[PDB]
């Protein structure tokens with residue numbers, strides 16, 4: 001019933017553009033929207049985010065997260081490891097590569113979402129959420145070697161899965177970080193289950 | 195270690211602006227970023243709210259109440275938590291209960307409210323509070339709920355059982371061109387993983 005009529009470029013940077021979108025609302029009335037897009041998509045999606053489940057025997061299962069300064073936020077954020085998919089890279093391969101670069105862990109793929117939207121009232125940005133387990137008892141994950149790209153500066157923060165939400169609430173209360181909404185949503189559902 | 199040096203306006207729409215952010219990297223080097231921001235954020239602890247609405251009814255499985263809308267940035271229909279921007283002076287809890295009623299017709303009760311969490315921190319400064327609300331679906335108030343959408347809001351309500359949310363979402367994605375929101379998908383994944 002609703003559809004895009006046209007898109008007008010307002011402004012194009014190196015990494016992001018702003019567009020004025022015209023669309024038909026369901027009454028037959030024409031309306032506008034200000035829409036953000038990345039200039040880098042080719043791709044099933046812009047990016048991947050990895051849910052990295054660190055499994056060590058005789059330990060709690062952990063979810064591996066990263067902390068980084070985020071210039072759009074003006075501060076540090078706690079997030080799922082993540083990055084843009086390289087042109088002709090598959091979501092799964094992007095997931096293992098990013099996880100290794102950002103955390104030093106080598107993981108196996110468990111499941112892969114379809115493309116999901118990041119903020120659909122604002123942008124067209126999408127990711128694949130890739131659940132990965134990490135056999136923390138293997139020698140390749142003993143002393144994980146993080147291989148950051150240029151200008152990437154990442155701290156690795158592993159938190160127990162069964163208390164994730166309480167552990168994140170504490171980090172916010174004590175360390176003035178912003179937690180990512182997807183991380184928070186995952187933590188909430190771990191508590192809300194059953 | 196890292197911090198913002200300057201924020202230069204590039205383009206200001208009615209609703210969105212693009213900025214050139216200059217910041218200090220942890221090596222002591224100046225770097226830049228392209229940052230998206232809304233123009234509507236005043237003194238709110240966040241831009242918006244997203245509601246996690248748990249529909250509870252005697253002798254029913256708990257449902258998660260979701261909405262489907264056309265999203266011009268995406269050029270298509272998206273399945274999301276009920277959500278909206280916080281009005282100036284409105285509390286996050288108030289905004290959540292108000293957006294939930296407007297979008298779905300249901301009258302919720304507050305359960306919990308997150309700190310401000312980031313939407314897509316490598317792209318924008320956009321934040322939300324994720325507000326968990328219970329809906330007493332035995333209450334006559336919530337029997338035959340009537341959405342009260344604002345101007346240009348065109349919303350379908352989709353209630354799915356919490357105990358099968360990820361599979362029910364996958365089934366909707368299999369049947370139409372629609373995108374699931376990343377926070378919803380994240381919440382559904384955690385429900386499986388628990």
Ligand SMILES: Cc1nsc(N2CCCNCC2)n1
Pocket residue numbers: 032033034035121122209210346
């Ligand atoms: C980013 C953006 N472009 S237009 C818009 N609004 C639509 C008009 C109704 N109010 C909701 C927000 N938001």
Ligand SMILES: Cc1nsc(N2CCCNCC2)n1
Pocket residue numbers: 015016151226227228229316317
């Ligand atoms: C929106 C945006 N402004 S700079 C940027 N980077 C590309 C992604 C990783 N490399 C660092 C620079 N992205």
Ligand SMILES: [Cl-]
Pocket residue numbers: 053110131387
């Ligand atoms: Cl798992």
Ligand SMILES: [Mg+2]
Pocket residue numbers: 081082083102
């Ligand atoms: Mg990254």
Ligand SMILES: [Mg+2]
Pocket residue numbers: 082083098101102149152
């Ligand atoms: Mg990376």
Ligand SMILES: [Mg+2]
Pocket residue numbers: 276277278293297
């Ligand atoms: Mg809304």
Ligand SMILES: [Mg+2]
Pocket residue numbers: 277278293296297344347
């Ligand atoms: Mg609304």
